Amino acid sequence: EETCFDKYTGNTYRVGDTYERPKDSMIWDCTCIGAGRGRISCTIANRCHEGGQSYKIGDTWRRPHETGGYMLECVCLGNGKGEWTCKPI
Amino acid sequence: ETLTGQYDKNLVTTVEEE
């Protein structure tokens, strides 16, 4: 019965609801907090954003090295800073 | 080499709005 309103998604939420918010060419993980002020907390700290794509921590993908042509395995490590690595495999 | 990237140092990762 306490709610939040998110102008980016245009939706109204209940305290405790979690949802994705597209903003600044990223996806954010948002939580409706409420706290007597319709507080929303949103974070990209559990994601990586690379190459026009949003990844979650733990995601892995493979792609050729753009110059070398050999295969890479990429991983979203996150670590509070969108840290990804791509390792030749 | 292993390629690597991360968010800009000055990008805030967690924000609150009321």
Side-chain angles (χ1 to χ4, degrees), chain A:
Chain A
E1 63 110 72
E2 208 188 350
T3 63
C4 311
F5 171 73
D6 192 306
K7 63 157 140 168
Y8 303 96
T9 75
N11 293 168
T12 281
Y13 300 88
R14 279 149 44 245
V15 168
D17 289 351
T18 53
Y19 63 92
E20 306 183 350
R21 171 199 284 188
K23 185 174 172 296
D24 301 326
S25 287
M26 301 183 291
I27 292 144
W28 301 65
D29 295 324
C30 294
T31 304
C32 177
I33 299 307
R37 292 209 184 282
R39 192 194 293 174
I40 300 162
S41 180
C42 300
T43 187
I44 52 165
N46 301 122
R47 292 181 176 248
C48 303
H49 288 95
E50 171 74 357
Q53 305 280 342
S54 175
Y55 300 93
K56 301 177 202 192
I57 293 190
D59 283 1
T60 71
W61 61 103
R62 286 181 195 172
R63 61 175 190 81
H65 191 278
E66 296 284 340
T67 286
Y70 47 84
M71 184 63 43
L72 309 167
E73 189 172 55
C74 304
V75 299
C76 180
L77 294 179
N79 292 325
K81 60 217 210 114
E83 182 182 0
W84 60 266
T85 57
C86 294
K87 182 191 92 264
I89 57 181

Side-chain angles (χ1 to χ4, degrees), chain A residues 21 39-44 47 49 81-86 88, chain B residues 1-8 11-18:
Chain A
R21 171 199 284 188
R39 192 194 293 174
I40 300 162
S41 180
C42 300
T43 187
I44 52 165
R47 292 181 176 248
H49 288 95
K81 60 217 210 114
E83 182 182 0
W84 60 266
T85 57
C86 294
Chain B
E1 70 179 18
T2 296
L3 312 162
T4 189
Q6 59 194 252
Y7 295 145
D8 190 289
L11 188 66
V12 78
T13 61
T14 306
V15 306
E16 307 198 326
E17 297 162 2
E18 282 166 340

